[PDB]
Design a protein around this ligand. Structure first.
Ligand SMILES: Cc1cc2nc3c(=O)[nH]c(=O)nc-3n(C[C@H](O)[C@H](O)[C@H](O)COP(=O)(O)OP(=O)(O)OC[C@H]3O[C@@H](n4cnc5c(N)ncnc54)[C@H](O)[C@@H]3O)c2cc1C
Ligand SMILES: Cc1cc2nc3c(=O)[nH]c(=O)nc-3n(C[C@H](O)[C@H](O)[C@H](O)COP(=O)(O)OP(=O)(O)OC[C@H]3O[C@@H](n4cnc5c(N)ncnc54)[C@H](O)[C@@H]3O)c2cc1C
Ligand code: SF4
Ligand code: SF4
Ligand code: SF4
Ligand code: SF4
Ligand code: SF4
Ligand code: SF4
Ligand code: SF4
Ligand code: SF4
Ligand code: SF4
Ligand code: SF4
Ligand code: SF4
Ligand code: SF4
Ligand code: SF4
Ligand SMILES: O=S(=O)(O)CCS
Ligand code: FES
Ligand SMILES: [Fe+3]
Lengths: 184, 148, 138, 652, 291, 374
């Protein structure tokens, strides 16, 4: 049983506003053009081994089901773009899923591993930073011991930190600058 | 203005009559032969390019002749002498901006035999001095009489 | 404190209908433009655009059928050749090429007309007023 | 005569009045020169609004009327007739658009929208002052019609016009009339044979005393205007004497070259000397010179000696008053939707190919068989909306008939083989007309046809068996299906016919976003075009079924019979004309007209241009290109347009 | 040809041999790879695009600015970085509202994107600008083995903006691997995802492994000796994923995994030691015996 | 009117004006054919010119005698929502523009005659029987909207906020009884949430109507766009089985309704409508078949997309012309494809909705087809 009180009528418009201006109003507003044909679900590699049904996520958004942001299903999309390529109604499915995940992250529905990844970029500028073994490997291979990346450039690390603070991404992941670690 | 036209205008005013100027464009008075099928321009040449035929209309030969957008009365001595009309008599009574109308006519007939496929960028690229080509004697009376 | 003065010339078969479609669908766009109706874009010639700038237009817009879809078969091909020359003449007269905008919009393209009106308005607003009339009134 | 203008500002209830301050626009209109009367009213097009203009034209002696309201494309004729009833010439009326172009698009900018309405009124008043009284051109109507396309729609138009007593010409591109209907076995929702309804009509039109049938012919040129069209028909050479031919087909049994039958969609093999189908009309043969080896074996068995390789195509010049375009459609090519594997997999066919397979006179003898091994399929899947309702292939429209023909062909397969399992993969079942929903109920209840709500994602072939697997989500269960089939039928949509581009250029007609031909108005003129004397009928106007194509054929006959019956039609006077005193015969205008109306001539010993009034359509291209100003389009003169431009910034 | 070489994260800090293999292969093809000093995470769309789109584009445009200041275009050997930087560039060029938002943020760090950067994927760069014929000319050691080509997903898709042709039936990589002497074997669901993308490897590991297992099985059934990819993410999933499949499901394949750069390197006479095949979780030795 | 959203009367009025002053058309309004005798080409018809009890020629059409009339009759033109007097005018743009007295509800008190200046009111007026000879006859009597009282689970005629789509057309119409304002009939407030229920009286064996009414999918989407244009904050849900947008620009209209206007579609035919007696709000019970879950959403107004049925006078016309009916109860054409506008009775033809449910262009095309055949 689904009542009006259990639905959030503006979920579709909310998803569109989160997509304006990135990836774009026209891109995310395409979720309204969906005619529930199921071509996206049939094309989904993840759907063939889980309860994830691409079409139902779009349906749940248009209907206003709040749980879609709390669901584990939206995080099963590998972003292969097959549904995006085959949609007959021009629904930018892959982009809508990513925008819904933004609202999920704001609600606090982020995996610890994904936040650790976001922390490494905020701290070291990279999702997969270099370690003592990296220096040794690069040396034996004939490459520069330390790659010309942000990790070994305080100018670039401080540039990213200024942008991250301005974007509010540090507050999103719950990062404490003084402690140098994530909260919760 | 030709001396006869000056006398005609003054004489009409002395008599009390209202002076009347010729109304047609220059091709009427011009002795050059026109194509019965209509005017068609293939390419645009500058006055020094090639050797013009003395009988054929200079506009059909590819030269910018202002005779089509210029009032008659001079006797068309320029095309008769081997050079295109420069439009020194100005436009007819039915045209305000001579250059604009000359540009309209030139663009319309350029590649008319191949209308759907002719490149619309050949003409603007071929004319490196547009104001000097169409507003020699009338720039101040044009809709846009100055360069901003 | 200032709003652009834009004049439009639209063909009765396609762009005029395209503008009506935008209206039927309540497709909002800026109120700077004032449209003038002609039967074909082939009716549009340099004299009408230059006259608009003389009168004080900050921007001039022209709309016709898609190339090959003219109600009168080829009127838009003549206008296309005239506008390319006019763009460069405007630059020689110190008028930014961007102050003239010509587009091919059908009777069913209401959304395209709305976005073309929004884009042209934003373009002219950024350029500021055309100071021709002010220079001529001195 | 000094202009006396009457300005009328419509409120359109609140459509205009709710955004634009109409009373303020009316006050502003009164400050303009020549404005004698200015009023605002709720509905200007209503009886009180029209009577208010008529009363003012008389009581205030007006010679100009300006109506600031909606679009001239909607009410220009209405207000033209209104002013004409009061004695004011209809070309002294000017329409200002303050609804579609202002109130409806500047709803959140009321002040600026009101100032825009004032400028639009001033621009209208500016042009109005220089408007002139004009008179319509009366032209005669040739008592003859032309129908292009001999399908069910075209045949119906020609039969109706012929039965009315009008001479009619029916041009058919292929060797036989009948169209796509002839390719179908049965026809929904009655499940009659296509032949049941079509063949008698084909027979009737071929021997009608008022219909001249030109089969295997094409219209190569059309010149003129309503009631005065000059057409050129190219009678293609069949290389057989039609009057001597019997149509026995002894020739076909001797021909040694095999050509793929276009009628059977490449699924059948025909000879160089052929007859499209056994019930073809005219019952005559045709030689394809593209594949004929000229061995002369067919000529040896032909008794009446009709075969003649020295035949040359004949150009027939005919004069007609009205033209009806009924060229039909083509089936969508599903190769582009690669996930379905058409053109790659042998057992993936289109619905039109299935029609030929199911047809008794078809290439398989009416047997549905797999093209990979010739076996009959035990399991069949129909895939709906192929090439329709799909933005990826550029076809965002409903092809109208695919739901019904899929259910019809499924019923027909069940009748021939009840053991067959049939599943229809759909999104929406569109059974919208009389007996259609009942046909849909019957397909499931009586024939056991299954429906799967889910547009398939892809089709996968087993290279070893040739069987196909359809991947699709059963949306009504929320589960993915991967059912195997012996044959997959793609319910292909409709697209305009390949020759549509050629016909469009010859008739000078427009196309709608779906690429089919554009009707004058969707609601009130469904078979007319904006080009006077040119009409539409059948699938070439848009995807539709036989009942609708037959009704359109009859509708087109009635509409095309109006000018013919009248014998006289009027042409708009908004044409170009040359002022002989200013034209010095520069010749710039001649080549600009696509209809060749402007022509150079000798007058009073000198050369001057002259426009053939009937030929002018009123575009305004040659007057715009005239460098002397001698050429002018009435109602769109340069001085009139110049004042309109001034009107945006100042009065006069 | 001069291009700012975007490294990313996994290649320069984990599978370093892919970098060394690219540096020499591109040098042999006449491409000058200039260091894109200070370049950070693309950032990975899987986490960043999913967490905050504004942050993904702002940080992506920051990297684009580095190459713009150098006055040269970008080249990458990672589908993730290609997809991230290419879609960022397109969006900034097509959407002015997005460009304004990003430049308002980059103004705080003294940067401004002007739209002069073009992002290129080395595979399509080799195919359209260099030519497949130049690969064969530089082949010192022909690799006559069967390869299970893995295009990945962020390479050709989305086709509407990438414009690299078909994503259902492509030939680009097949023709590039076949130029080394190898044979691209056709397998079931060739264009399907490896399962690692969109943050699925990190959040739903078993789900990602189920998809990789199917791809490996299909490649092995087709007669493939190894698998080639153009993505360090796909590489990690196929290589490290086989260890996880063995530890969770109990299925062992020992299927060698190679990044196209390493495949082209082997073909161009490079020393297996310089390609760092020893750091691979699955041994490439069975493949090295076949070549 | 869908799919162009053109003003219906603003585009039909010119044709009404044209037919009223056509030199070859004799218009007998407020008249009925009472007898037809003969055969093809030789029909002898009797037309009863009904008495308006108001002098036709002296009638100005101002409307001042109605104010005093004490009898209130439900206005048929407004589908029973509005109230008219015994003396009236159907709609403001009526052709011919004249008033009429309804003797079925007239009490003959003579109060209207006291106010009337022209003294046009004459109760001694007698209907005129006009004998005319014709060669062909075209039946174009149209249709009536289905009465949804029978589907009791929906509560029409019981709940105040449950209306039909034809009643909504009138509420939306500017010249309507509410002045073009969509309002709840229980409290006069504008509804913030609206539900459209498709196939009411169609595709239903329980009401004896197993056919598709053809225009309900399209008019529901159209009226939903009109409401969104007037009030964008309004939430609109359409409860359907199949969206039938089968003609030119129809599928595009459907795409536009969802994408541009944010109209929502729920695949599932509602089981019942339940009214909250305290607020007048309605609850629609229906299964969202695309989710496999039961929905119980609340609305301020429920609109029943009623189907088409033959007009009430169809029985009388059938007997007079001697024509047959099809299973849907509409008139039977000679052949569904060989003759769509002919009847088996020579010289008698059909045109419009009386032959079967269809839209305007189809009815207009049939009108033209019938003209050609006749
Ligand atoms: C697989 C399939 C099954 C169908 N089943 C049914 C059904 O069961 N019932 C039903 O009602 N409808 C059905 N339809 C729809 C039906 O086919 C059309 O309604 C019908 O054929 C339309 O008739 P038409 O004359 O308008 O077009 P067409 O049948 O296509 O006729 C057009 C004619 O014009 C000719 N022509 C083309 N170009 C030229 C030219 N340049 N000059 C001269 N002549 C030209 C053609 O050769 C052709 O003879 C089906 C359609 C398909 C594809
Ligand atoms: C709610 C609703 C919305 C709709 N919206 C649209 C839309 O947006 N677009 C669209 O195209 N279509 C729409 N339709 C369909 C449209 O109403 C019909 O297509 C159209 O009315 C058909 O016209 P008609 O002349 O055949 O019949 P009608 O319109 O019903 O007219 C029949 C006429 O005959 C008269 N009459 C009846 N009996 C007799 C008799 N015995 N003697 C003499 N005269 C008689 C009647 O008084 C009436 O004037 C809608 C229908 C409904 C119910
Ligand atoms: S393919 Fe497109 S329209 Fe179809 S269900 Fe998926 S997102 Fe909706
Ligand atoms: S993009 Fe996501 S939802 Fe779409 S098919 Fe790929 S994994 Fe499934
Ligand atoms: S040369 Fe000049 S003046 Fe003479 S006919 Fe040609 S265009 Fe006219
Ligand atoms: S330039 Fe002057 S004098 Fe010479 S031909 Fe032209 S108008 Fe006559
Ligand atoms: S004239 Fe136009 S704007 Fe005025 S009421 Fe009529 S349709 Fe509405
Ligand atoms: S060509 Fe001769 S043999 Fe062939 S069908 Fe005609 S009459 Fe018979
Ligand atoms: S001559 Fe031509 S038609 Fe006759 S049998 Fe030979 S190939 Fe066939
Ligand atoms: S009629 Fe049916 S199969 Fe055909 S396009 Fe429309 S919904 Fe799809
Ligand atoms: S273009 Fe003007 S001047 Fe030249 S021939 Fe035509 S009407 Fe005469
Ligand atoms: S105005 Fe257009 S249609 Fe008329 S004569 Fe000139 S070019 Fe021809
Ligand atoms: S009956 Fe009398 S009061 Fe009523 S509308 Fe007619 S004239 Fe006016
Ligand atoms: S006489 Fe009849 S119409 Fe007149 S007021 Fe009395 S009840 Fe009304
Ligand atoms: S048109 Fe739509 S709402 Fe009307 S009966 Fe058919 S399916 Fe039901
Ligand atoms: O996880 S990411 O999608 O960012 C990279 C996979 S290519
Ligand atoms: S009619 Fe639109 S451009 Fe010719
Ligand atoms: Fe109106």
């Amino acid at each position: 049983m689904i009542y009006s009180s259990d639905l959030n009528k503006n979920l579709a418009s909310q998803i569109i506003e989160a997509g304006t201006p990135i990836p774009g109003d026209d891109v995310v507003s395409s979720l309204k053009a969906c005619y529930q044909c199921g071509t996206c679900t049939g094309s989904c590699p993840s759907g063939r081994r889980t309860s994830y049904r691409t079409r139902k996520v779009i349906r749940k958004a248009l209907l206003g089901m709040d749980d879609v942001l709390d669901s584990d299903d939206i995080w099963k999309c590998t972003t292969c773009y097959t549904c995006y390529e085959r949609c007959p109604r021009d629904v930018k499915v892959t982009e809508i899923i990513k925008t819904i995940r933004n609202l999920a992250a704001q609600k606090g529905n982020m995996a610890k591993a994904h936040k650790m990844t976001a922390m490494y970029v905020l701290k070291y500028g990279h999702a997969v930073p270099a370690n003592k073994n990296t220096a040794e490997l690069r040396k034996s291979i004939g490459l520069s011991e330390k790659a010309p990346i942000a990790q070994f450039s305080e100018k670039d690390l401080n540039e990213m930190n200024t942008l991250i603070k301005e974007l509010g991404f540090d507050e999103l992941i719950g990062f404490d600058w003084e402690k140098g670690a994530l909260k919760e | 203005p030709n001396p006869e036209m000056i006398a005609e205008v003054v004489k009409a005013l002395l008599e009390g009559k209202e002076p009347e100027l010729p109304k047609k464009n220059l091709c009427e008075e011009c002795a050059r032969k026109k194509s019965e099928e209509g005017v068609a321009i293939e390419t645009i040449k500058r006055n020094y390019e090639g050797n013009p035929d003395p009988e054929k209309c200079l506009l059909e030969q590819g030269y910018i002749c202002l005779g089509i957008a210029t009032r008659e009365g001079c006797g068309a001595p320029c095309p008769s002498s081997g050079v295109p009309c420069s439009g020194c008599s100005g436009p007819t009574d039915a045209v305000v901006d001579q250059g604009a109308k000359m540009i309209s006519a030139l663009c319309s007939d350029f590649g008319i035999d191949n209308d759907r496929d002719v490149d619309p960028m050949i003409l603007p690229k071929s004319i490196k001095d547009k104001i000097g080509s169409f507003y020699k004697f009338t720039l101040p009376s044009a809709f846009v009489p100055i360069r901003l | 404190e200032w709003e652009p003065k834009i004049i439009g010339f639209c063909c009765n078969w396609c762009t005029y209908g395209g503008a009506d479609t935008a209206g039927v669908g309540r497709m909002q766009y800026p109120p700077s433009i004032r449209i003038i109706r002609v039967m074909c874009s082939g009716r549009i010639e340099p004299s009408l655009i230059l006259k608009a700038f003389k009168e004080g237009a900050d921007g001039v817009f022209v709309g016709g059928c898609h190339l090959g879809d003219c109600h009168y078969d080829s009127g838009n091909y003549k206008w296309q050749r005239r506008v390319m020359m006019l763009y460069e003449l405007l630059e020689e007269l110190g008028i930014e090429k961007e102050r003239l905008n010509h587009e091919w919009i059908s009777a069913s393209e209401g959304e395209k007309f709305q976005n073309t009106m929004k884009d042209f308005y934003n373009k002219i607003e950024a350029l500021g007023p055309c100071k021709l009339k002010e220079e001529l009134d001195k | 005569e000094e202009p006396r203008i009457g300005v009328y500002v419509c409120h359109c209830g609140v459509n205009i009045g709710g955004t634009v301050d109409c009373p303020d626009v009316t006050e502003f209109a009164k400050t303009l020169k020549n404005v004698v009367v200015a009023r605002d009213y709720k509905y200007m097009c209503a009886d009180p609004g029209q009577e208010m203009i008529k009363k003012d034209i008389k009581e205030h002696n007006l010679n100009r009327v300006v109506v600031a309201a909606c679009s001239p494309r909607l009410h220009e004729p209405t207000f033209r007739r209104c002013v004409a009833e009061a004695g004011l010439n209809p070309f002294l009326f000017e329409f200002a658009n303050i609804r579609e172009h202002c109130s409806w698009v500047h709803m959140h900018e009321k002040e600026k929208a009101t100032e825009k309405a004032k400028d639009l009124v001033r621009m209208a008043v500016a042009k109005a002052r220089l408007l002139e009284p004009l008179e319509f051109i009366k032209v005669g109507v040739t008592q003859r019609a032309l129908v292009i396309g001999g399908g069910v729609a075209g045949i119906q138009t020609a039969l109706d016009l012929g039965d009315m007593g009008f001479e009619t010409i029916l041009v058919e591109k292929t060797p036989s009339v009948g169209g796509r209907m002839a390719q179908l076995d049965k026809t929904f929702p009655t499940n009659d044979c296509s032949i049941c309804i079509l063949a008698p009509k084909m027979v009737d039109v071929a021997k009608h005393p008022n219909v001249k049938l030109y089969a295997y012919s094409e219209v190569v040129d059309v010149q003129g205007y309503v009631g005065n069209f000059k057409v050129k028909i190219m009678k293609k050479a069949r290389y057989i004497d039609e009057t001597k031919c019997t149509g026995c087909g002894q020739c076909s049994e001797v021909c040694p070259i095999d050509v793929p039958n276009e009628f059977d969609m490449g699924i059948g093999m025909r000879k160089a000397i052929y007859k499209p189908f056994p019930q073809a009309v005219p019952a005559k043969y045709t030689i394809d010179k593209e594949h004929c080896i000229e061995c002369g074996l067919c000529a040896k068995v032909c008794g009446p000696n009709a075969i003649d390789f020295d035949q040359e195509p004949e150009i027939i010049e005919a004069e007609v008053g009205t033209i009806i375009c009924a060229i039909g459609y083509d089936a969508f090519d599903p190769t582009v939707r690669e996930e379905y594997g058409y053109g790659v997999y042998d057992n993936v066919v289109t619905a039109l190919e299935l029609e030929r397979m199911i047809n008794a006179s078809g290439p398989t003898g009416g047997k549905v068989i797999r093209l990979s091994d010739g076996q009959k399929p035990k399991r069949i899947a129909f895939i709906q909306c192929v090439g329709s309702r799909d933005a990826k292939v550029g076809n965002k429209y409903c092809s109208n008939v695919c739901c019904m023909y899929a259910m019809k062909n499924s019923q027909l397969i069940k009748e021939k083989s009840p053991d067959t399992e049939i599943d229809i993969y759909y999104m929406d079942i569109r059974a919208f007309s009389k007996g259609y929903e009942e046909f849909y109920e019957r397909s499931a209840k009586q024939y056991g046809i299954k429906f799967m709500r889910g547009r398939p994602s892809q089709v996968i072939e087993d290279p070893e068996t040739g069987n196909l697997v359809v991947r699709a989500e059963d949306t009504l269960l929320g589960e993915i299906l991967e059912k195997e089939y012996d044959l997959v039928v793609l319910s292909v949509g409709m697209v305009p016919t390949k020759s549509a581009d050629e016909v469009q250029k010859i008739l000078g007609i427009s196309r709608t976003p779906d690429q089919f031909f554009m009707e004058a108005h969707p609601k009130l003129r469904p078979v007319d075009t904006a080009t006077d004397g040119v009409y539409l009928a059948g699938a070439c106007q848009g995807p539709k079924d036989i009942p609708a194509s037959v009704a359109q054929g009859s509708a087109a006959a009635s509409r095309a019979a109006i000018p013919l019956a009248k014998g006289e039609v009027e042409v708009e006077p908004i044409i170009a004309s040359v002022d002989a005193e200013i034209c010095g015969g520069c010749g710039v205008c001649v080549k600009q007209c696509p209809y060749g109306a402007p022509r150079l001539v000798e007058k009073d010993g000198k050369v001057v241009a002259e426009v053939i009034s009937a030929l002018c359509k009123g575009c305004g291209t040659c007057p715009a290109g005239c460098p002397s100003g001698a050429l002018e389009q009435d109602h769109f003169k340069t001085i009139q347009l110049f004042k309109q431009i001034e009107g945006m910034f100042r009065d006069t | 040809m001069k291009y700012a070489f975007f490294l990313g994260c996994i290649m320069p800090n984990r599978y370093a041999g892919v970098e060394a293999a690219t540096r020499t292969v591109m040098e042999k093809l006449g491409v000058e790879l200039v260091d894109m000093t200070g370049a950070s995470c693309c950032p990975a769309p899987g986490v960043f695009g999913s967490f905050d789109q504004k942050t993904w584009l702002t940080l992506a445009a920051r990297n684009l600015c580095i190459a713009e200041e150098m006055g040269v275009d970008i080249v990458t050997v990672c589908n993730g970085c290609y997809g991230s930087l290419f879609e960022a560039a397109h969006l900034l060029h097509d959407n002015k509202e997005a460009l304004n938002f990003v430049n308002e943020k980059l103004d705080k760090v003294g940067k401004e994107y002007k739209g002069n950067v073009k992002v290129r994927h080395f595979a399509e760069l080799i195919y359209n600008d260099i030519g497949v014929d130049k690969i064969a000319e530089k082949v010192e050691r022909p690799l006559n083995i069967n390869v299970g080509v893995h295009y990945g997903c962020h390479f050709l898709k989305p086709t509407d903006v990438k414009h690299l042709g078909s994503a259902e039936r492509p030939v680009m990589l097949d023709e590039i691997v076949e130029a080394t002497g190898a044979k691209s074997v056709p397998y079931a669901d060739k264009m399907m995802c490896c399962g690692a993308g969109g943050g699925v490897r990190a959040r739903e590991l078993e789900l990602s492994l189920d998809m990789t297992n199917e791809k490996i099985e299909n490649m092995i059934k087709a007669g493939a000796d190894c698998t080639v990819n153009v993505c360090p993410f796909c590489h990690l999933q196929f290589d490290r994923g086989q260890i996880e499949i063995k530890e969770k499901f109990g299925k062992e394949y020992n299927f060698p995994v190679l990044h196209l750069s390493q495949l082209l390197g082997l073909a161009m006479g490079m020393d297996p030691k310089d390609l760092a095949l020893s750091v691979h979780q699955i041994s490439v030795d069975p493949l090295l015996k076949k070549i």
